[PDB]
């Protein structure tokens, strides 16, 4: 292939900045590079064709350019409808390529996650096998390390994490790191314990049932 | 202007062919000079093109990373045109969408995407329609210390995944989050909503999440309470 490589994996931007998202290709490309939005569930939007020729009705915000093997799509007075991804994509020939993409979202201050710990039900401790969910709460921004120790020392699997959408009305949002156990595993130790690393807070937080005792 | 409107099943089982249809209105896919696409995009990631048909003749271009599984046709009456990935596994699961390459003018052979169809999220895998069972997420102590607390349900164990959870038949709106579903190594997707609530309300105020599955016509209401340490009670 030619590789298309667009540099920002993501970034926070507040409405009115000039966003500069780029892409790269891995071999000159002439000017054959489009360039798309694309809001969650919807289909994409083209947005800039040729390397600089903007579709008919894009606002004129959008500002394509670059030639050869390095692109840039420029975001200047960035509306509150301008945050979506936006995703490169070289049309020399078969096979058509794409962009990895970048997440243009909303920046606003600092939160902590408020951290609770779940533990399981006897309904669920019936089956044979339980989930104990730690939670993330209304924080921002999104990298947030979720260790699991049980009883003392740590569980290294067993934890699918998920992660909310910013919040349509504070930007912030939330992670769920559930630990997933045999019931007969689950009864044989005592403290369970998520701790969570994330940077609004000045050290690791740790939430804990003994259940050695409930 | 034009539409493309694509249809087809959104499971499709371990090796089986999974069929896709787009749907072209307000265009011609007999029309000269435009090519009829199909692109997938995993979960997250970025987009990847796979094939497409030429308008005016059968003529098809092929992502070589799929050559031997896919075949893309036009349906010249009808204003149709399909796919076909044979022989699906884990790694097929993707939305699906269809879209519409025209020239760009400045260049001979330069065919850039102009317009999509909303896209079809297909998952590939086992399991027949599933309810889910429903377990109360709720600290084992009363938190008293902190002035707000959290309570939730887990949503586990079901197939295809619309399921829907609402609190107190509605009128809990405020705190409120529901994460995305997660198909576990069983073949089956869990969820979680939780809310966060006053902790003075807890013991005076009840709370109930409400689940459907419309799939397998299941509705649940699961009532969260503070944990016993035995067992609880109704």
New interface residues.
């Given amino acids: 292939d030619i590789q298309m490589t667009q540099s920002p994996s993501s970034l926070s931007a507040s409405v009115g900045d000039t966003v500069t998202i780029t892409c790269r290709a891995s071999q000159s490309i002439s000017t054959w590079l489009a360039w798309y939005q694309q809001k969650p569930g919807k289909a994409p939007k083209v947005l800039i064709y040729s390397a600089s020729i903007l579709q008919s009705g894009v606002p004129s915000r959008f500002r394509g350019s670059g030639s050869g093997s390095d692109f840039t799509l420029t975001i200047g007075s960035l509306q509150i409808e301008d945050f979506a991804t936006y995703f490169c994509q070289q049309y020399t020939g078969s096979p058509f390529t794409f962009g990895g993409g970048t997440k243009v979202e909303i920046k606003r201050t600092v939160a902590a996650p408020s951290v609770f710990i779940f533990p399981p039900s006897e309904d669920q401790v019936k089956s044979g096998t339980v989930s104990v969910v730690c939670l993330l709460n209304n924080f921002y921004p999104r990298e947030a390390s979720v260790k699991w120790k049980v009883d003392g020392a740590l569980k290294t699997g067993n934890s699918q994490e998920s992660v909310t959408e910013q919040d349509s009305k504070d930007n912030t949002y939330s992670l769920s790191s559930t630990l997933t156990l045999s019931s007969t595993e689950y009864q044989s130790h005592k403290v369970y314990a998520c701790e969570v690393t994330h940077q609004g807070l000045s050290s690791p937080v740790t939430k804990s049932f003994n259940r050695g005792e409930c | 202007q034009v539409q493309l409107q694509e249809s087809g099943p959104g499971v499709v089982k371990p090796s089986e062919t999974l069929s896709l249809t787009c749907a072209v209105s307000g265009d011609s896919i007999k029309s000269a000079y435009q090519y009829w ?1 199909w692109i997938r995009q995993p979960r997250g ?5 796979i094939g497409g048909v030429y308008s005016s003749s059968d003529s098809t ?5 799929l050559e031997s599984r896919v075949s893309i046709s036009r349906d010249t009456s009808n204003n149709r045109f399909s796919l076909n990935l044979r022989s699906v596994t884990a790694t097929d699961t993707a939305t699906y ?1 269809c ?1 519409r ?1 025209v020239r ?1 003018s ?2 001979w ?11 079809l999220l297909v998952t590939v895998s086992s399991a027949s329609t599933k309810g889910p ?1 429903v ?7 009363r938190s008293t210390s902190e002035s ?3 309570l ?1 349900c ?1 949503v ?1 164990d079901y197939f295809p995944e619309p399921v829907t959870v609402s609190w107190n038949s509605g009128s809990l709106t405020s705190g409120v ?4 579903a ?1 198909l ?1 190594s069983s073949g089956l997707y ?1 969820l ?1 909503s ?1 809310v ?1 609530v006053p902790s003075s309300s807890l013991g005076t105020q009840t709370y109930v999440c409400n689940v459907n599955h419309k799939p397998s016509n299941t509705k649940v209401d699961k009532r969260v309470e503070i ?6 009670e109704v």
């Fill in positions: 696409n990631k970025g987009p990847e093109w271009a092929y992502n070589p990373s969408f879209a390459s760009d400045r260049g052979g330069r065919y850039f995407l102009d317009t999509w169809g909303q896209g069972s377990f109360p997420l709720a600290p084992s102590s707000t607390a959290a939730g887990l586990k989050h529901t994460f995305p997660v576990q869990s979680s939780v966060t944990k016993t340490c035995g067992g609880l």
